[PDB]
DNA sequence: CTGTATCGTCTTG
DNA sequence: CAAGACGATACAG
């Protein structure tokens, strides 16, 4: 049930997303096998140039903690205060700190 | 078993 | 009618 996007298939996106920006429809077309959402997620939670790689450092975790003690569970919004993260980013971290908490 | 990328679905633009 | 948003879920390791 999940289409994992493989390191070919992140290639091929990022040439297309150089090719035609940001149009999905399009840039979906020239995979026999994904839609334009599948692409948009990808590349917007994964591949932007702006996403951040590198393991959450201490104050990271911190920062998010404060941040939902301040705003609940507003992941969107929380996320505007991680230059490379996303809301996607931001819930999984919560997930697995609170797990780690004891939830 | 856990950590996390994808997906169902609702909401917003 | 596309894109944003969030909970749930698959699944690798």
């Given at each position: 049930?999940?289409?994992?996007?493989?390191?070919?298939?992140d290639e091929?996106?990022?040439?297309?997303?150089?090719?035609?920006?940001?149009?999905?429809?399009?840039?979906?077309?020239?995979?026999?096998?994904?839609?334009?959402?599948?692409?948009?997620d990808?590349?917007?939670?994964?591949?932007?140039?702006?996403?951040?790689?590198?393991?959450?450092?201490?104050?990271?975790?911190?920062?998010?903690?404060?941040?939902?003690?301040?705003?609940?569970?507003?992941?969107?919004?929380?996320?505007?205060?991680?230059?490379?993260?996303?809301?996607?980013?931001?819930?999984?971290?919560?997930?697995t700190?609170?797990?780690?908490?004891?939830?």
């Amino acid at each position: 049930k999940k289409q994992k996007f493989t390191p070919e298939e992140d290639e091929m996106l990022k040439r297309a997303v150089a090719q035609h920006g940001s149009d999905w429809k399009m840039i979906a077309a020239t995979f026999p096998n994904r839609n334009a959402r599948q692409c948009r997620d990808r590349w917007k939670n994964y591949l932007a140039p702006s996403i951040s790689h590198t393991p959450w450092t201490a104050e990271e975790d911190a920062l998010l903690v404060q941040k939902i003690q301040e705003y609940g569970r507003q992941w969107a919004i929380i996320a505007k205060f991680f230059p490379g993260r996303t809301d996607i980013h931001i819930k999984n971290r919560w997930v697995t700190i609170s797990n780690k908490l004891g939830i």
